[PDB]
């Protein structure tokens, strides 16, 4: 790990927050209609693939215009709470003069974010799967060398592993993924060797929705990997039924705390050593 | 023999000469014991025996009724006639008794404080000999035909288990890992035996008429496949290179570990160069066996010539390993003999058979 070898190489401090972004009332109505519509009922009956319902709810939590399909054009940022928080963070960070990585698993919502950035006056650069590979290295370089480009747009899985995006200072993960490793790679890509300034990661979640359960699954898988690879003894965080049931909507009203904080509420052998080890392992 | 004593006193011959010559003479004079008896406690046939490697005093015996009896072979009485009394017993009333026949029992090498027993109840149990309680249990998806711990390993403590599955299991007695398996056989693995010479060399004999030597550290399958003809009938390896023309149901490395004795259901025993698996073409004649499970047979140690004691019907056939010459038939059992174990300290033999008897063969005079 970077615990025993840390003293040999430097590492700037990294802070990370998980913002819980309330659903907008129209977005909330669409989500509740979907979780009450007969499609999720058929999913619970097993007559239809649950996967389409998952994709649909992820689309809803990203932005209603994905699922549903002036100041009313495609992808208006005022109709999804996560885009409200992205508005606030982008404005504040631009006033601070920092540089942003904007991550999202969906390329369609990546394009929605592009259209939003064009609606604003932020200079930006995009690299995704649609860009030719032979021209991927220039864009990164142009972002890393100057400061006249503010926000760089990614999905978590484009480019080679660990493309050198060092000139960025802040990073926002617009939506969680099922794999913990792709989000860990997203945050790692900005915060690598030879990073000059403190990098902070903001994960955007919608509370009480499918996205919160995606983050819970991500933490659960990370815990499983850690238990297997570093230490078996580990404080248990989760419930079997609550972790696996992921077609409900309980948005917080701020009277009661969010599900994540409720879950994370606390924070030669001489035949006798051989026999001792056997009986020790067997009593457990 | 007075010549032997005189040569030893006068330094003409090394005492090694007298020791090994007298060991060979004692083995040749093996006969039904005149003044010795073994206590009878198994309700069924004895499938396996094991005298502890250090001090050679205590003997384990697994019966077809699932009980495991621990005998003291020392004549602690003052008479010339004694019975090998049973010290301990995993009987039918023990909470951890095997539900079916115990097929292999083996003392832990390097220490007598632990032993192991595998049964057709799909379990390899590790017993603390003092408390006589199961220190551990390894469960298998299919019945165990044989198992063996390395008699040499100061480093590893793996138990090689051969079940009716086509995979050789390696159960780590250090922190319990029974996941390791060896692929390459195709039918039940009727016998397994670690090399006494090389730490990580394991020979496995299976009903597919093949014997394979594995370096268990290795990631690339078996080292050698034994071939009767050594290449006279050569074919791309899918079904050729068979050790026998039947099921190979018994393995035994020689005392030095430089050769391997394999007995198969084609009524043949064969001797193999353990370093390249070449057949040495030692004849041995016809060795009658039809056992559908593993056949336990042992070799002599500390003698001028090495001997092999093979169950032969209701008898023990004693052969010279490197010449194949038939020494004799020990004839005292009433049913087919399942196992024979050799006490090397005094050139004694203990044979267990289906007649619920353990018979002791001692040198005469």
* DSSP secondary structure of B161-201: EEESSSSEEEEETTTTB---EE----S---EEEE-SSSTTE
Q: Could you report how far apart the first and last alpha carbons of chain B are, in Å?
A: 13
Instruction: Please name every residue paired with B163 in a beta bridge, in sequence order, or none if there are none.
Output: B144
Helix axes A180-190 and A210-229, enclosed angle (nearest 10): 90
Sheet holding B315-320, edge to edge: B298-299, B307-312, B315-320, B326-330
Q: How far is CA A191 from the centre of its chain?
A: 16
DSSP letters, B72-124, are: E-S--SSSS-EEE-EEEEE-TTSTT--SS-EEEEEEPTT-SSEEEEEETTTEE
The chain A residue lying nearest B114, using CA atoms, is: A271
CB distance B49 to B59 below 8 Å: yes
Residue with tokens 């606030």: A88
Determination method here? cryo-EM
How many other C-beta atoms can be found within 10 angstroms of the C-beta atom of residue A97? 9
As a whole number of angstroms, the distance between CA B19 and CA A197 comes to 82
As a whole number of angstroms, the distance between CA B103 and CA B339 comes to 10
As a whole number of angstroms, the distance between CA B197 and CA A20 comes to 66
Helix or strand or coil: residue B326?
A: strand
> Any CB–CB contact under 8 A between A278 and chain B?
yes
Helix or strand or coil: residue B19?
A: helix
As a whole number of angstroms, the distance between CA B218 and CA B47 comes to 33
CB distance B166 to B185 below 8 Å: yes
As a whole number of angstroms, the distance between CA A204 and CA A211 comes to 9
Q: Could you report how far apart the first and last alpha carbons of chain A are, in Å?
A: 29
Q: Is A139 exposed, middle or buried, given 0-12, 13-18 or 19+ CB atoms closer than 10 A?
A: middle
Pick among B53, B110, B131, B135 to test the A interface (most A CBs inside 10 A): B135
Q: Which residues of B202-230 are buried (b: 16+ CB within 10 A; e: fewer)?
A: bbbbbbbbbbbbbbbeeeeebbbbbbbeb
The chain A residue lying nearest B153, using CA atoms, is: A268
How many other C-beta atoms can be found within 10 angstroms of the C-beta atom of residue A242? 13
> Taking Cα atoms as reference points, which of B283, B271, B274, B269 lies closest to residue B311?
B269
CB distance A149 to A171 below 8 Å: no
B137 chain-A contacts, CB cut-off 8 A: 282
CB distance B214 to B202 below 8 Å: yes
> Any CB–CB contact under 8 A between B131 and chain A?
no
Helix or strand or coil: residue B209?
A: coil
Q: Which residues of B238-258 are buried (b: 16+ CB within 10 A; e: fewer)?
A: eeebbbbebbbbbbbbbbebe
Q: How far is CA B48 from the centre of its chain?
A: 8
> Any CB–CB contact under 8 A between A268 and chain B?
yes
Min Cα distance A62 → chain B (Å) is 44
The two structure tokens encoding residue B79: 């008479």
CB distance B60 to B359 below 8 Å: no
As a whole number of angstroms, the distance between CA B347 and CA B27 comes to 6
> Taking Cα atoms as reference points, which of B323, B302, B204, B303 lies closest to residue B253?
B204
Give the nearest partner residue to A282 out of B111, B135, B157, using CB atoms. Answer: B135
The two structure tokens encoding residue A59: 């689309």
Q: What angle do CA B111, B116, B121 make, to 5 degrees?
A: 175
Q: Are strands B268-273 and A124-126 parallel, antiparallel or unpaired?
A: unpaired
Q: What angle do CA A148, A154, A156 make, to 5 degrees?
A: 145
DSSP, res B17: H
As a whole number of angstroms, the distance between CA A4 and CA B76 comes to 61
Q: Which residues of A157-179 are buried (b: 16+ CB within 10 A; e: fewer)?
A: bbbeeebbbbbbbbbbbbbbbeb
Sheet holding B248-253, edge to edge: B248-253, B259-264, B268-273
Sheet holding B168-172, edge to edge: B144-149, B158-163, B168-172, B181-182
Helix locations, chain B, DSSP H: 2-10, 15-28
As a whole number of angstroms, the distance between CA B89 and CA B135 comes to 16
> Taking Cα atoms as reference points, which of B211, B124, B125 lies closest to residue B163?
B124
As a whole number of angstroms, the distance between CA A156 and CA A262 comes to 28
Residue with tokens 């960070």: A93
DSSP letters, chain A, are: -TTTSTTTS----EEEEEEE-PPPHHHHHHHHHHHHSHHHHHHHHTSS-HHHHHHHHHHHHH-HHHHH----STT-GGG-HHHHHHHHHHHHHHHHT--EEEE-S-HHHHHHHHHHHHHTT--EEE--TTS-GGGHHHHHHHHHH-SS--EEEE-TT-SSTT----S--EEEE-S--S-HHHHHHHHHHHS-TT--S-EEEEEEE-TTSHHHHHHHHHHHHHHHHHHHHT-S-------HHHHH---------SSS--HHHHHT------SSHHHHHHHHHHH-
Helix axes B2-10 and B15-28, enclosed angle (nearest 10): 160
Sign of CA dihedral A186, A189, A192, A196: negative
Q: Which helix (H) or strand (E) holds B342?
A: strand B337-343
Pick among B58, B173, B177, B199 to test the A interface (most A CBs inside 10 A): B173
Give the length of chain A. 284
Give the nearest partner residue to A271 out of B111, B174, B175, using CB atoms. Answer: B111
Torsion angle (degrees, nearest 10) of CA B301, B306, B309, B310: 130
**Resolution of the PDB structure in angstroms:** 3.1
Q: What share of chain B is helix, strand, coil (3-state, %, to 5)?
A: 5, 40, 50
Q: Which residues of A186-212 are buried (b: 16+ CB within 10 A; e: fewer)?
A: bbbbbbeeebeeebbbbbbbbbbbbbb
Q: Across the interface, do A268 and B128 touch by the CB < 8 Å criterion?
A: no
Instruction: Please name every residue paired with B124 in a beta bridge, in sequence order, or none if there are none.
Output: B118, B138
DSSP letters, A186-253, are: HHHHHS-TT--S-EEEEEEE-TTSHHHHHHHHHHHHHHHHHHHHT-S-------HHHHH---------
How many other C-beta atoms can be found within 10 angstroms of the C-beta atom of residue B314? 16
Residue with tokens 């300290």: B345
């Amino acid at each position: 790990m970077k615990s025993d070898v840390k003293m040999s190489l430097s590492l700037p401090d990294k802070n990370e927050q998980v913002l819980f972004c309330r659903l907008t009332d129209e977005q909330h109505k669409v989500y509740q209609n979907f979780v009450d519509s007969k499609e999720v009922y058929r999913i619970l009956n097993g007559e239809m693939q649950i996967f389409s319902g998952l994709i649909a709810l992820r689309k809803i939590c990203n932005h209603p215009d994905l699922f549903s399909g002036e100041e009313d054009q495609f992808g208006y940022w005022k109709r999804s709470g996560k885009m409200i928080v992205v508005e606030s963070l982008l404005k504040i960070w631009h006033k601070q003069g920092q540089r942003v990585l904007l991550f999202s698993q969906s390329r369609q919502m990546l394009d929605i974010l592009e259209v939003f950035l064009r609606a604003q006056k932020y200079t930006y650069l995009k690299m995704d799967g649609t860009t030719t590979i032979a021209s991927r290295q220039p864009l990164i370089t142009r972002y890393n060398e100057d400061t006249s480009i503010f926000v760089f747009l990614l999905t978590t899985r484009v480019g080679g592993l660990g493309v050198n995006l060092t000139g960025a200072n802040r990073v926002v993960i617009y939506d969680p993924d099922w794999n913990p490793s792709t989000d860990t790679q997203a945050r790692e890509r900005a915060w690598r060797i030879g990073q000059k300034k403190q990098v902070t990661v903001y994960r955007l979640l919608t509370a009480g929705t499918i996205e919160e359960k995606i983050y819970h699954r991500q933490i659960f898988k990370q815990f499983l990997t850690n238990r297997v690879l570093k230490d078996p003894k580990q404080r248990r965080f989760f419930k079997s039924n609550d972790l696996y049931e992921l077609f409900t909507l309980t948005s917080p009203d701020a009277s009661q705390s969010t599900e994540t904080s409720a879950i994370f509420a606390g924070t030669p052998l001489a035949s006798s050593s051989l026999l001792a080890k056997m009986r020790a392992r067997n009593h457990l | 023999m007075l010549g032997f004593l005189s040569a030893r006193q006068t330094g003409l011959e090394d005492p090694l000469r007298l020791r090994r010559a007298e060991s060979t003479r004692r083995v040749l004079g093996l006969e039904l014991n005149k003044d010795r008896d073994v206590e009878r406690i198994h309700g069924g046939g004895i499938n396996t025996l094991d005298i502890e490697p250090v001090e050679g005093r205590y003997m384990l015996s697994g019966g077809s009724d699932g009980v495991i009896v621990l005998y003291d072979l020392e004549n602690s009485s003052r008479q010339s006639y004694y019975t090998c009394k049973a010290v301990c017993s995993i009987g039918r009333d023990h909470p951890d008794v095997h539900r079916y026949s115990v097929e292999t029992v083996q003392w832990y090498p390097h220490d007598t404080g632990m032993f192991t027993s595998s049964s057709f109840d799909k379990t390899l149990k590790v017993w603390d000999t003092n408390t006589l309680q199961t220190a551990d249990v390894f469960n298998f998806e299919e019945t165990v035909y044989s198992h063996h711990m390395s008699p040499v390993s100061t480093k590893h403590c793996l138990v090689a288990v051969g079940t009716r599955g086509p995979k050789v299991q390696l159960c780590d007695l250090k922190s319990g890992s029974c996941s390791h398996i060896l692929q390459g056989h195709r039918q039940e693995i009727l016998a397994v035996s670690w090399s006494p010479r090389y730490d990580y060399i394991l020979a496995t004999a299976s009903a597919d008429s093949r014997v394979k030597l594995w370096d268990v550290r290795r990631a690339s399958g078996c080292l050698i496949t034994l071939d009767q003809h050594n290449g006279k009938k050569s074919q791309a390896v899918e079904s050729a290179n068979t050790a026998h023309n039947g099921k190979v149901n018994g393995l035994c490395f020689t005392s030095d570990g430089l050769h391997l004795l394999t007995v198969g259901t084609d009524n043949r025993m064969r001797l193999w160069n353990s370093s390249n698996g070449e057949n040495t073409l030692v004849n041995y004649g016809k060795v009658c066996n039809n056992s559908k499970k593993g056949l336990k047979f042992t070799v002599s140690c500390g003698c001028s010539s090495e001997f092999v004691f093979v169950p032969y019907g209701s008898t023990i056939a004693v052969y010279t390993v490197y010449s194949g010459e038939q020494i004799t038939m020990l004839k005292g059992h009433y049913k087919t003999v399942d196992c024979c174990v050799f006490q090397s300290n005094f050139q004694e033999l203990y044979s267990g058979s289906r007649d619920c008897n353990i018979l002791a063969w001692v040198p005469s005079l």
